[PDB]
Every structure is written in C-alpha cells, then in structure tokens.
Amino acid sequence: PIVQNLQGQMVHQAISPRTLNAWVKVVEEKAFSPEVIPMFSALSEGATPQDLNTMLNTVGGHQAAMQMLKETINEEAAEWDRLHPVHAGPIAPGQMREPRGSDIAGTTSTLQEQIGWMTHNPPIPVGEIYKRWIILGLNKIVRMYSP
Amino acid sequence: PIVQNLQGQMVHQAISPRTLNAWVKVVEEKAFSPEVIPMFSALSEGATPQDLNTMLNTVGGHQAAMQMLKETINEEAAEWDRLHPVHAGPIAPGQMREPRGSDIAGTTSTLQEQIGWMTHNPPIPVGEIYKRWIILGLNKIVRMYSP
Amino acid sequence: PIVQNLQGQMVHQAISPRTLNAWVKVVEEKAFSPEVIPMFSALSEGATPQDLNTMLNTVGGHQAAMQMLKETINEEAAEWDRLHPVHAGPIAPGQMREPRGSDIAGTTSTLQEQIGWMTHNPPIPVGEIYKRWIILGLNKIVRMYSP
Amino acid sequence: TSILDIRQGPKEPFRDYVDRFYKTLRAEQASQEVKNWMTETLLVQNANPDCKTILKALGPGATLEEMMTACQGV
Amino acid sequence: TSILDIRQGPKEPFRDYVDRFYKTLRAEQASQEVKNWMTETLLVQNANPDCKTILKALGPGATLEEMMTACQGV
Amino acid sequence: TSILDIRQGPKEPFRDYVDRFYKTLRAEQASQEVKNWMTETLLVQNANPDCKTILKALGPGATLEEMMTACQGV
Numbered sequence A, B, C: 001p002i003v004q005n006l007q008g009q010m011v012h013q014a015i016s017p018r019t020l021n022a023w024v025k026v027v028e029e030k031a032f033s034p035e036v037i038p039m040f041s042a043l044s045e046g047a048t049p050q051d052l053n054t055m056l057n058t059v060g061g062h063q064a065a066m067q068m069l070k071e072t073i074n075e076e077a078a079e080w081d082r083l084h085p086v087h088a089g090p091i092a093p094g095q096m097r098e099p100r101g102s103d104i105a106g107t108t109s110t111l112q113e114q115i116g117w118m119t120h121n122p123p124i125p126v127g128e129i130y131k132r133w134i135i136l137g138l139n140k141i142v143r144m145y146s147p
Numbered sequence D, E, F: 001t002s003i004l005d006i007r008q009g010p011k012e013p014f015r016d017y018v019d020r021f022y023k024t025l026r027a028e029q030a031s032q033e034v035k036n037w038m039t040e041t042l043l044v045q046n047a048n049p050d051c052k053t054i055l056k057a058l059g060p061g062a063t064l065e066e067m068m069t070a071c072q073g074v
Helices: A017-030 A036-043 A049-057 A063-083 A111-119 A126-145 B017-030 B036-043 B049-057 B063-083 B111-119 B126-145 C017-030 C036-043 C049-057 C063-083 C111-119 C126-145 D014-026 D032-045 D049-058 D064-070 E014-026 E032-045 E049-058 E064-070 F014-026 F032-045 F049-058 F064-070
Strands: A002-004 A010-012 B002-004 B010-012 C002-004 C010-012
Touching: A002 A111, A010 A111, A017 A036, A017 B017, A017 C017, A017 C036, A036 A126, A036 B049, A049 A111, A049 A126, A049 C036, A063 A126, A063 E014, A063 E064, A111 A126, A126 E064, B002 B111, B010 B111, B017 B036, B036 B126, B049 B111, B049 B126, B063 B126, B063 D014, B063 D064, B111 B126, B126 D064, C002 C111, C010 C111, C017 C036, C036 C126, C049 C111, C049 C126, C063 C126, C111 C126, D014 D032, D014 D064, D049 D064, E014 E032, E014 E064, E049 E064, F014 F032, F014 F064, F049 F064
Parallel strands: none
Antiparallel strands: A002 A010, B002 B010, C002 C010
C-alpha cells in the first residue's frame, strides 16, 4: 500500500503477512457472505491495484465466482476505456500519461507508475475506481450466490 | 481513528486488524451481555463516525438487534436535527458548516470533514454524540434481550 | 531483505520468524497449488538471493520437486552465463564486478556483494532474475503435479 | 432463497423468523421505500396464525420491540 | 489431471462442475484467445445430457450467471 | 428475565443466588435509591425459608460478608 511516512510524505510499504492471512481466513470462513464487502473495504485501505490483483490471485477455491469477477473487472475496464477516450496529440515531457482500464486493473501499469498517479498533484483515485468494480462484481456474486 | 502524532498534531491513522478482530470476537462470544458496552467504549477511543459505521456494518448475525439499533441511530439523528435547527443565512467562506444528524452518523460527511470538525478550534465531539446514541441503543437492546 | 530505513537509505534487515513460519505453513498446507506463486511473490518482496536459498533450503518433504527445482535453477543459471559473457579485460578499481549465474543464485556472492549490486547506482535486479527462475520452475512443477 | 420464501413455522418463535427476515432483507438491494413496504407487509403476512392474530391486535404504528415482546409467548 | 478429462457427472450439479473447470483452467497457462475457445467449447461439450439440452436452448451470447441459473434444477 | 423472577432454590446456596441477583441488578438501570430499596428488600424476600430464618436473626444494618458467611451452612 501507499502510506504516509513520519517525515510527512506518501511512500509505498508492503502489506503485512497476518493482514494477508486475515484476508485468506475471511474468505475461508464467510465465503460469499455480505460481511466480506466492508471487511474487504477496511483491509483495502490505501491499497494499490497491484495489491488488489495479489489479493484476487491468492484466492483458492470458488473458481466459478473468481472467473465471473475477472470477466466483470474486464467489462468495467472496457467501459473505462469507452467512457474516457485517449487524449489529444502526443504525451507532454512535463507530464505523465493518462491511465487506461488495464492501468486501473494494474495490468499495464508498473508500481512506480501507480505511485506517480496517486501521489502526484492532483492525484487520481485508480484504487477507488477498481474498488467500485470489485464491490459491483461482489454484488453480482452475492446476488447469484443467494439460494 | 484520529490520534496525536509525535510532532504534536492530531492526524488520522487507520484502525488495526487485531483491533477489528477483537471487536468481532467480543460480539461472537458475549453477544448482548453488558460487558460489551465498556468494551466498546475502550475500543472506540478516538474513533470516527466512519469507523463506528465500519464496526456496525461488519457485524454478522443478530439482525433483529442490528435493525433495532439502526432505527435508534436514525431516531436519535432525527432528534439531533429537530433540537438543533440550521443556522441563519449562507455559510461563511472563512468557516466550515455545522453538522446535521446524518453528518454525525457519518453518512453525509466525508472523512476530511469529520477530521475538520474534531481537529478544528473549538472542536465538536460528533464521536461522543454518536457514542451516546450507540450506548442508549445498547441499553434498549440489553433490556429487551434480558430473558 | 534490503529495506529502506527511516533516514532514507537502503539497509539490510533480517526476515521475521512468523514470516519464516508463514512460508513454512503455506507449503505445508497448499503443497504445489498455484496460490503458492503470488504468495511466494508477496513474501519475497525486497528479498535477497541469500534469503531465497534460505527459504528453499528450509523446505521439508516434496524432495523430488525440490530436486527438479534445483536443477531448473542451475539450468537457468547456466543459461545466464551463456547469454551474458564475461566482460573485456581486468576489473576496474573504481568498479565492482559483473554477476554470474551462481552470484544470482547467491552461491558465489556474499551478502555485502548482494547489497552492493542492488543498492548501487544503476542497481541490478538479481532478485528479480532469480524470481523468474523460481516462478518458471514453479510452472514446471505445477504442470507436472497436476493429476 | 427468495424473500417471498421466508415464512414463520407453526412452532417457530417469531423472534427467530424476524432474524431470518432482516438477514434476507440484508441481501435485498431495493430502494428504501420498497424495503419499507416489504417490512410492513410481508413480515406479518408470512407470520403464523397464532402470532398473526396477536399482531393484528397491535394495530398500525407498531415498532419492533413492541412486536417482538408482543409475540413472545406464542 | 488434463482439462479434457474434466466432465460433468450424470447426478453432479453443473455448478460443482463449473468450479472444477475454472480451477483446471486456472492451471492452464495458454493464450487468452485459446482459453476463450476452451470456455465456449469444452464446458458445454462435457456437460451432462440433461443440462446440455438446457444450454443448447440458451443459444450463443450467454453469460455465466444465466448458464448457472439455467441449469439449477437439473 | 425480570428481577422479581430471581429467587433462591430450596437446595441452592445463597451465595449462588446473590451472584445471580447482582448480575440481574447489573442489567437494571434505575436510580441508586431504588436499587438500594431492591437490595434490602427483594434479596431477603426471595431467599429460601432456611436462610431466610437465618437472615431475620442478623437484624438490620447487616453487610454482605456477614450475610454471606451467615447463610453458609444452609
């Protein structure tokens, strides 16, 4: 995640193993139950896309759901690209590039790039955009997996 | 929560997973027992409304009680709005807006707004107002759930 | 691992016992399952070759796989030496030596040497080169150990 | 399971039923106004005859602590 | 176990089969286009006659929630 | 359970009963003066005949260690 250091700057720090394991354990115990979404939200505080793929990729089991989510993440990403067209002409030397759906999904962007966008002024909340897609896709799952 | 940093200022820091889990475990083990209220009170030290909705939303089980509480929180909030009318004329550029029942419940306010009110001089104790509503609603529950 | 200190420099710090044990426990529980690879990747964040041999050497059980991996690590290392020939003439006093496959595998290099390469400017990512060999060799294993 | 399929047993305490209701209501995502409509309507309708009888005597305007204490002996 | 060896039982819910499929698909490392081809093809092909029949009626263009709700009673 | 429903068994040690009393008293939220009234009154009243007899001999002014040691053999 990207956290604030004592000095008063935003720097990246790694997520903790008993945080990781707590994510694992939630999924083990409460599967598709709604409490998973606030839980997720708390444990995703200050998290990167990269950390969010890590959390999704580290799941075991419920592979039908994991595939449905993936496909929702790509749909929501396809929709990001649709709604926000690429911008006019070449990229400025003085500036950094606008993200695509795949940069938001973490796929085409690097960590330093993910830190550029979030730490820069104005900052862009690429975590929160992926977060809604995850929560939206979580609703899809919850609604389906209701019996 | 909003905590004091080493430098001597009040800054927000996130609540800890084994704090979260300790909240979960209390509820699991002691359900509606009275010891839950001092326990709550200690674990709510320096907490935001936002953190208080997080704690309430992360409950599983006892949904009749959770609904009774919600409805108590809204009643107490409706009562806040009644007792404290909105103030005269437009909001000053030099000042920040007075809270409503829903800002106290965390609903209509943002975190930075919740930090403005609490950190500013004079500070307003929107945590402690929600805290009484929670404790009051906890009494309602305790009294009902006595057998 | 090599981590950034508060002062703003990169220094080595030892890996933690409950990190070690978490590595052990993953292997115990999920054996050759794919979730092992993101898991590995997270727990290998900022890790040295030396720490990576420590993690491989501390395995118990699955010795056929451990041997297949070793032999993959040496093949990938042999390939490093092939692709990158040694450089022209004697080593400069002002400079430090280029790594071989065995320095990447941690075998012929010392820790201070591993810290020289990574902390120096430009830095060389000898962790990430070993990491791909580990992940590649992990694919070999996963594919074989599928039933 | 659908919200319409939530019903009170002939020997099941109302209390255990009301818990089931706001759990399933907790998995409904509808507008609040619709969920208010569901509350006043469906809860009583799928309540058992003995308690149903009781709840009819509370009249309208009733709140959950009073419903919950009203059907306790049933 | 190979992906071709993944098949639906005569009494096995589709759901339990689809889980097995994307677990094994999760251990395939092929290009996405090939994995798309596997999805639309192999899944239905090794599905049981009763559900297979059902899935033929959904036509093409179908998505996983609709397939999964379509073969639920089977 | 209501505070009036708290009573001492015919074989139950007073001690186990006094624990039950201040637990239920712990869930009463009334003014201190009322809770003092409950203490001197209800505790003895729902105490069993054998201990009740004992407690009548302590007279008024008695404190909990002396009541608790007074009904120990009963």
